[PDB]
């Protein structure tokens, strides 16, 4: 029982445990109410709404949870502004997420086994975020790690299922511990580089492994009676290696389908993603994104085999699109961090699916000019331990309206441009975006993580015949159907990625911060947004009909219910209708002319 | 950097011990799938041998066949598979993938996919954990044998799963590695913590010894300086894996509110037994064992302690102790030892997820009982073998002779268990790990029994005193809301016959008959004819037991044995039981032919 043991106990006994508990509860309740999963009584007061949530205790008798909140013009999102108080005889602030959920779900029905996992994820989030917060007291690399807060919406934004406290201290991105990758050799019976990636992959091994070290690895392979020409080389997260590959691949290790080689020469360090590591020794070198079998936000951190296969072809396709577009290339100067090489070992087995794979991505340091710095886009709405907006200084310096205008211009507009001019919808969540700035002045946007979340509407492409052919890349694409991967047959996929991903779940978080902290009204926020959208597309008259057909000004739209998906089995279409703030903003924008 | 433990794991996986373990795990798997009728291969009979042809389908839905040779044995019709398991499609190849074997076989035969995946995972983890153990083993007192029999269960195809241990934890806590460990002491608030039923006085006394007055005093002073009242807490020892990987992360809210308070480490070192949640005191061998909660899955079940069973443990042991001390045969002739679970404590809340997760039962050290020339061996040790295949009882058999040794064994070991059933209506769970042979240089002396709290069944009409039967309904709220057959008490007399045939014989004593036949050419028929003679010899001394003995029907031709593997492949099923022949039946027929 060492110092890390002591740390963990102190973290829990501290005020940071209370604070983290209150936050998970807050976020949980906002989400249940917003999505209409529960339906409290609502008593209106001047600004606030008092919600009364019904439940039943273990004894099948009545209980109320009280809290005060707001229903916001920004997509009708709910903010809970107070403690969540359990009323039976006497009032007390809720101590147990588990108790809260089960009392509340005796009244409203859910699938029990889903409830159980969800409760476990919320508890683990509290646990893991408690010690992150207890452990905290810039520039891009530091900021990635030091914004430890994680997701503003998802009740369990920290679960890390499969990490107990020591692994968490070792691997959690908040702690910034250097680590080494494990190099293995993987037999070509089951291993493949990314589609049409062979030349690039062979070149990247030269710089990544090192030339001499690679020769020495091949000699060792020969010294076992194996033929190095029959193998590819894959880096593996050391946690993944020790806790997953060794036990689940034993059969491949015994027959030399997999050969342990050794440790990377360079040290690496986790990013917000944690399956994504930067080279600490040489920061110009590519990041590596590797398989991790760990459950964070209800999904395993595995890399899908079809997705790994296609990552390089996708980055090459996108890079061409952007390079032939004068606005994106010359004016907004958008940055795409290319996932330019990939490799994987994929056997039939269901249990190991997506468990060993790697994608290399360009460092954002390749792109940063001198004088330029970068911040993760979800950092723009982040706060200091004492609750001060991390962008406070900048806003004081540049003014709120001017800073926000520039932000919309350098960051939001290019994303929407891509949707309307190209029918290409990049996953627009804050975690995919990085703002490049100069002393806090917004300059250009960088985008990443294409291989997982990209969507597109084929008829809008400039060249349909240049659209990468997915069916030739993987048997899974080949046997798949329309809408399963990347391609939508519905034009509404475009409207939805913009309203839902870009605005409701990401940029909208900024509007909350500016309203509550600087008294900059949400109506004025969406005003600026409409104005900049309009200033852009007025320069592109041929886009007029198409802009309209996308309907960004629709008075309401159907938004994903992300939390409901966690409580229910069928989950076919879980959407709820919400108001669209752009609608009213545009009506006022029109009157104002 | 990757260390020497990493290097070991890799060498073990890359070695020949991996091939043997894989082969063994496949063998036990196929044996039980055929035995329980989960699959029904074609059977082609040679003189003795059977060729088994098992159907499957590959992923392209093309037929495949698995082939092996084996036997159906007179001992309960158990299946022995004597040859490698070969996959036949185009060519023939020994099967390398337990997952593939199971996937192909279950494309033909329907199971629950979900259960199939877990089972495959457990089989792979078994292979993985046992490979490291077989690889580390080299080429003996009681304590030394507990940790040196590394083979685990001869029936269950995954006998090593240990779901929740990766290789490093396995090295630390796996009983094969005999690593000394410290218990973690916690204080638990009496709002949720209780001593076992009517155990308060014995518990207070046992904390004196186990913690020490000095430490306990210092423990109380620590709680007091946190502004908590030392009189509101009990004290529970926790496995250090359980504390760090389970309690700390799942009890955070109890730690926050001082429902649970960390005190420190035990003074003494402990070492795991075959059970791994049961720890012996290494520093002071006469001190009691600790059986503690562990949330890991071995053989498909969580290693938690059921709260109701922790609560009734001290009372069950007092009850059994009294039954023995008033019976001349058991007390005087047999001299049976019952290692008493004499104290227990737990912290138990509502939460479903932590159910059974923090609990402790203390048990008497077998060293309390051993005479000056006596030693002890775990009962499943009797059928264990050395890495090279020599039965570990080999020297003893050479010294006393086989028939003489087997008769003494039956007379001192098997008879008193059966006596308990017939005279007392009490069936202790009689499997191999519940029994300890006490011997003098390999001469069988007497039997010691353990693990009462979970396993025991009884038939109320058979009790010598039905009113001395402990009233469980008063001990825990789960017993009081429970129904007949739920815990400990069976309404059917067949409960008793099944505990003898199925637990004592089929899954335990029968394994010895296999070893004697295959190693020494001692025929299974002779083995069972000795068992019958000895049972008869005993009961001819107790005429008052005749009609009771008859009604139990140990000589019935066929009976219903548990299907243990089937249970791992289905959520719900109609039976769980299958009919097997009883070797005591024919043996008795023949024993009768003497007169
Ligand atoms: N012959 C055997 N009979 C019963 N159990 C055995 C035998 N051989 C090995 N074992 C193993 O002993 C282990 C004991 O686990 P268990 O938790 O049931 O014991 P306990 O209740 O803690 O005492 C099991 O994993 C079981 O598989
Ligand atoms: Cl980083
Ligand atoms: Cl012999
Ligand atoms: Mg046992």
From Swiss-Prot, chain A:
It is an enzyme of class 6 (ligase). One of its GO terms (biological process) is siderophore biosynthetic process. One of its GO terms (molecular function) is ATP binding. It catalyses: N(8)-citryl-spermidine + spermidine + ATP = N(8),N'(8)-citryl-bis(spermidine) + AMP + diphosphate + H(+); N(1)-(3,4-dihydroxybenzoyl)-N(8)-citryl-spermidine + spermidine + ATP = N(1)-(3,4-dihydroxybenzoyl)-N(8),N'(8)-citryl-bis(spermidine) + AMP + diphosphate + H(+). Changing residue 304 to M: Increases acceptance of polyamines lacking a secondary amine. Pathway: Siderophore biosynthesis; petrobactin biosynthesis. Its EC number is 6.3.2.-. InterPro entries: Aerobactin_biosyn_IucA/IucC_N, IucA/IucC-like_C, LucA/IucC-like. Disruption phenotype: The deletion mutant cannot produce petrobactin on iron-depleted medium. In vitro analysis show that mutants grow to a very limited extent as vegetative cells in iron-depleted medium but are not able to outgrow from spores under the same culture conditions. Changing residue 452 to D: Displays selectivity close to that of wild type. Pfam families: FhuF, IucA_IucC. Changing residue 304 to A: Preference for spermidine is not completely abrogated, but activity is increased with unnatural nucleophiles such as spermine, l,8-diaminooctane and cadaverine. Keywords: ATP-binding, Ligase, Nucleotide-binding. ATP binds at residues 273-275, 289, 301, 381, 452. Belongs to the IucA/IucC family. Involved in the biosynthesis of petrobactin, a catecholate siderophore that functions in both iron acquisition and virulence. Catalyzes the ATP-dependent condensation of spermidine with N(8)-citryl-spermidine or N(1)-(3,4-dihydroxbenzoyl)-N(8)-citryl-spermidine, two intermediates in petrobactin biosynthesis pathway. Homodimer. This is Citryl-spermidine/3,4-dihydroxybenzoyl-citryl-spermidine:spermidine ligase. The gene is asbB.
